Design an enzyme around this catalytic site. Structure first.
Site, PDB file in Angstrom:
ATOM      1  N   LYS A  19       0.842  -1.174   0.000  1.00  0.00           N
ATOM      2  CA  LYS A  19       0.000   0.000   0.000  1.00  0.00           C
ATOM      3  C   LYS A  19       0.879   1.225   0.000  1.00  0.00           C
ATOM      4  O   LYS A  19       1.827   1.334  -0.777  1.00  0.00           O
ATOM      5  CB  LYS A  19      -0.874   0.016   1.219  1.00  0.00           C
ATOM      6  N   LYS A  38      10.152   5.145   6.149  1.00  0.00           N
ATOM      7  CA  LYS A  38       8.830   4.669   5.691  1.00  0.00           C
ATOM      8  C   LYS A  38       8.327   5.598   4.604  1.00  0.00           C
ATOM      9  O   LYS A  38       8.069   6.770   4.874  1.00  0.00           O
ATOM     10  CB  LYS A  38       7.819   4.655   6.840  1.00  0.00           C
ATOM     11  CG  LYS A  38       6.499   3.949   6.547  1.00  0.00           C
ATOM     12  CD  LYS A  38       5.513   4.196   7.690  1.00  0.00           C
ATOM     13  CE  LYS A  38       4.308   3.267   7.639  1.00  0.00           C
ATOM     14  NZ  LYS A  38       4.650   1.855   8.017  1.00  0.00           N
ATOM     15  N   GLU A  87      12.592   4.745  13.907  1.00  0.00           N
ATOM     16  CA  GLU A  87      13.607   3.995  14.649  1.00  0.00           C
ATOM     17  C   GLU A  87      13.647   2.688  13.841  1.00  0.00           C
ATOM     18  O   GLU A  87      12.685   2.368  13.150  1.00  0.00           O
ATOM     19  CB  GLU A  87      13.088   3.725  16.079  1.00  0.00           C
ATOM     20  CG  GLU A  87      14.068   3.162  17.085  1.00  0.00           C
ATOM     21  CD  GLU A  87      13.398   2.629  18.370  1.00  0.00           C
ATOM     22  OE1 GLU A  87      12.551   3.324  18.998  1.00  0.00           O
ATOM     23  OE2 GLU A  87      13.745   1.491  18.762  1.00  0.00           O
ATOM     24  N   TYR A  88      14.739   1.942  13.902  1.00  0.00           N
ATOM     25  CA  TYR A  88      14.826   0.675  13.176  1.00  0.00           C
ATOM     26  C   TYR A  88      14.846  -0.467  14.213  1.00  0.00           C
ATOM     27  O   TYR A  88      15.643  -0.426  15.151  1.00  0.00           O
ATOM     28  CB  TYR A  88      16.095   0.698  12.303  1.00  0.00           C
ATOM     29  CG  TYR A  88      16.676  -0.642  11.896  1.00  0.00           C
ATOM     30  CD1 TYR A  88      16.013  -1.491  10.999  1.00  0.00           C
ATOM     31  CD2 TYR A  88      17.884  -1.068  12.429  1.00  0.00           C
ATOM     32  CE1 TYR A  88      16.555  -2.740  10.652  1.00  0.00           C
ATOM     33  CE2 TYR A  88      18.427  -2.294  12.103  1.00  0.00           C
ATOM     34  CZ  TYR A  88      17.768  -3.131  11.219  1.00  0.00           C
ATOM     35  OH  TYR A  88      18.348  -4.348  10.928  1.00  0.00           O
ATOM     36  N   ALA A  89      13.953  -1.451  14.079  1.00  0.00           N
ATOM     37  CA  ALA A  89      13.927  -2.582  15.010  1.00  0.00           C
ATOM     38  C   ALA A  89      14.645  -3.780  14.379  1.00  0.00           C
ATOM     39  O   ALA A  89      14.070  -4.496  13.579  1.00  0.00           O
ATOM     40  CB  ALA A  89      12.506  -2.936  15.350  1.00  0.00           C
ATOM     41  N   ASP A 132      -5.029  -0.810  17.873  1.00  0.00           N
ATOM     42  CA  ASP A 132      -4.501  -1.574  16.745  1.00  0.00           C
ATOM     43  C   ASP A 132      -3.278  -2.403  17.121  1.00  0.00           C
ATOM     44  O   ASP A 132      -2.218  -2.313  16.504  1.00  0.00           O
ATOM     45  CB  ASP A 132      -4.180  -0.635  15.577  1.00  0.00           C
ATOM     46  CG  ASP A 132      -4.078  -1.371  14.244  1.00  0.00           C
ATOM     47  OD1 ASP A 132      -4.635  -2.489  14.132  1.00  0.00           O
ATOM     48  OD2 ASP A 132      -3.456  -0.826  13.303  1.00  0.00           O
ATOM     49  N   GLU A 136       1.334  -7.653  13.805  1.00  0.00           N
ATOM     50  CA  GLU A 136       1.981  -7.022  12.650  1.00  0.00           C
ATOM     51  C   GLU A 136       2.462  -5.597  12.960  1.00  0.00           C
ATOM     52  O   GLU A 136       3.256  -5.022  12.217  1.00  0.00           O
ATOM     53  CB  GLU A 136       1.068  -7.047  11.410  1.00  0.00           C
ATOM     54  CG  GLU A 136       0.735  -8.441  10.889  1.00  0.00           C
ATOM     55  CD  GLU A 136      -0.462  -9.064  11.620  1.00  0.00           C
ATOM     56  OE1 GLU A 136      -0.965  -8.396  12.569  1.00  0.00           O
ATOM     57  OE2 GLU A 136      -0.880 -10.211  11.257  1.00  0.00           O
ATOM     58  N   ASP A 150       3.677   1.966  14.499  1.00  0.00           N
ATOM     59  CA  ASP A 150       2.478   2.312  13.758  1.00  0.00           C
ATOM     60  C   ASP A 150       1.305   2.831  14.584  1.00  0.00           C
ATOM     61  O   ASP A 150       0.364   2.093  14.857  1.00  0.00           O
ATOM     62  CB  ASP A 150       2.015   1.094  12.959  1.00  0.00           C
ATOM     63  CG  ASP A 150       1.370   1.478  11.650  1.00  0.00           C
ATOM     64  OD1 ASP A 150       0.922   2.644  11.524  1.00  0.00           O
ATOM     65  OD2 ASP A 150       1.303   0.615  10.747  1.00  0.00           O
TER      66      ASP A 150
HETATM   67  N1  LIG Z   1      11.797  -8.934   7.616  1.00  0.00           N
HETATM   68  C1  LIG Z   1      12.835  -8.446   8.368  1.00  0.00           C
HETATM   69  O1  LIG Z   1      13.860  -9.108   8.459  1.00  0.00           O
HETATM   70  C2  LIG Z   1      12.711  -7.242   9.027  1.00  0.00           C
HETATM   71  C3  LIG Z   1      11.463  -6.572   9.069  1.00  0.00           C
HETATM   72  C4  LIG Z   1      11.336  -5.342   9.755  1.00  0.00           C
HETATM   73  C5  LIG Z   1      12.459  -4.756  10.409  1.00  0.00           C
HETATM   74  N2  LIG Z   1      12.416  -3.628  11.076  1.00  0.00           N
HETATM   75  C6  LIG Z   1      11.593  -2.628  10.940  1.00  0.00           C
HETATM   76  N3  LIG Z   1      11.773  -1.584  11.800  1.00  0.00           N
HETATM   77  C7  LIG Z   1      10.913  -0.525  11.662  1.00  0.00           C
HETATM   78  C8  LIG Z   1       9.893  -0.463  10.712  1.00  0.00           C
HETATM   79  C9  LIG Z   1       9.797  -1.590   9.880  1.00  0.00           C
HETATM   80  N4  LIG Z   1       8.887  -1.608   8.959  1.00  0.00           N
HETATM   81  C10 LIG Z   1       7.815  -2.316   8.974  1.00  0.00           C
HETATM   82  C11 LIG Z   1       7.774  -3.629   8.387  1.00  0.00           C
HETATM   83  C12 LIG Z   1       6.560  -4.386   8.409  1.00  0.00           C
HETATM   84  C13 LIG Z   1       5.386  -3.831   9.012  1.00  0.00           C
HETATM   85  C14 LIG Z   1       5.436  -2.511   9.594  1.00  0.00           C
HETATM   86  C15 LIG Z   1       4.222  -1.861  10.240  1.00  0.00           C
HETATM   87  F1  LIG Z   1       4.183  -0.502   9.868  1.00  0.00           F
HETATM   88  F2  LIG Z   1       3.042  -2.476   9.805  1.00  0.00           F
HETATM   89  F3  LIG Z   1       4.318  -1.964  11.635  1.00  0.00           F
HETATM   90  C16 LIG Z   1       6.651  -1.774   9.567  1.00  0.00           C
HETATM   91  N5  LIG Z   1      10.630  -2.670   9.977  1.00  0.00           N
HETATM   92  C17 LIG Z   1      13.690  -5.432  10.356  1.00  0.00           C
HETATM   93  C18 LIG Z   1      13.820  -6.660   9.674  1.00  0.00           C
END
Ligand SMILES: NC(=O)c1ccc(Nc2nccc(Nc3cccc(C(F)(F)F)c3)n2)cc1
EC number: 2.7.11.1
Length: 264
Positions: A19, A38, A87-89, A132, A136, A150
């Site tokens: 999206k 993002k 932030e990056y997780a 929410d 996810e 989010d």
């Molecule tokens: N598949 C990996 O190895 C993987 C996936 C995600 C991350 N980290 C990360 N941090 C921050 C934001 C973010 N975006 C993200 C991804 C999916 C859903 C969402 C949502 F916005 F829906 F929460 C955000 N993703 C690191 C490794």
């Protein structure tokens, strides 16, 4: 406190999504700092009239500071889209953790729920209901801790909003689905659902149709697989009350014998 630009970053690996935008691993050129960028297209937003939910999302997460609440750093936007510097997780989503193991044991399940409570306990203290809490929207920090991300569908409380709905109710209380007015107790119903899904490996109200789930949810129809212990059954049964005022307070949840027995 400072305006950035796409030129200040070096986009990297696609973390994923769909999206409005794909979240990328990005690198702040000046400090070499790692973060997630993002990307949201205006055409996607405008056309769905989300401007306010992004302005809300970007404003709330904009202040909240908690160890378990993913941080928003700021943003900018060129001609055809808006960018959110997040932030990056490191460890990804809790959603993939679950696909990865199928179900969680009472220890992570007890931990995430705790971290999640302390996390919610914070936003609630500032009349900010998330509304929410699906796996996810839950990420993992380098140490493996849960981080609520989010805050889009997020609002202040008490609120009455009825927003054409996301596809899935699975995580919404009888009050939000029935269009009725609601408060902070909405996150406690979700925390109960999220807890069940962690142990059983599927949400308590999963159905095949939107209407099937809505029926299951509104009548609060859920059963337990045999391996779920009375300790958890108990907690999940106190959270999954059709009437908001009967759901526990977040302290009672951080106190629950089962949570204390397995939370590290
Ligand atoms: N598949 C990996 O190895 C993987 C996936 C995600 C991350 N980290 C990360 N941090 C921050 C934001 C973010 N975006 C993200 C991804 C999916 C859903 C969402 C949502 F916005 F829906 F929460 C955000 N993703 C690191 C490794």
């Amino acid at each position: 406190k400072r305006q950035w630009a796409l030129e200040d970053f070096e986009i990297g690996r696609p973390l994923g999504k769909g999206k409005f935008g794909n979240v990328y691993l990005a690198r702040e050129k000046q400090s070499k700092f790692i973060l997630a960028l993002k990307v949201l297209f205006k055409a996607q937003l405008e056309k769905a009239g989300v401007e306010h939910q992004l302005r809300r999302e970007v404003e709330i997460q904009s202040h909240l500071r908690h160890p378990n609440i993913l941080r928003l750093y700021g943003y900018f936007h060129d001609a055809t889209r808006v960018y959110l510097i997040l932030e990056y997780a490191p460890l990804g989503t809790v959603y993939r953790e679950l696909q990865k193991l199928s179900k969680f044991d009472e220890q992570r399940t007890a931990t995430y729920i705790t971290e999640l409570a302390n996390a919610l306990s914070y936003c609630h203290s500032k009349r900010v209901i998330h509304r929410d809490i699906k796996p996810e929207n839950l990420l993992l920090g380098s140490a493996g801790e849960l981080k609520i991300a989010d805050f889009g569908w997020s609002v202040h409380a008490p609120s009455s909003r009825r927003d054409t709905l996301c596809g899935t109710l699975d995580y919404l209380p009888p009050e939000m689905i029935e269009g009725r007015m609601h408060d902070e107790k909405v996150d406690l119903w979700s925390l109960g659902v999220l807890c069940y899904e962690f142990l059983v490996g599927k949400p308590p109200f999963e159905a095949n149709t939107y209407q099937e789930t809505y029926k299951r949810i509104s009548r609060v129809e859920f059963t337990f697989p045999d391996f779920v212990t009375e300790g958890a059954r108990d907690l999940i049964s106190r959270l999954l009350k059709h009437n908001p005022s009967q759901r526990p307070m977040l302290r009672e949840v951080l106190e629950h014998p089962w949570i204390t027995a397995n939370s590290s």
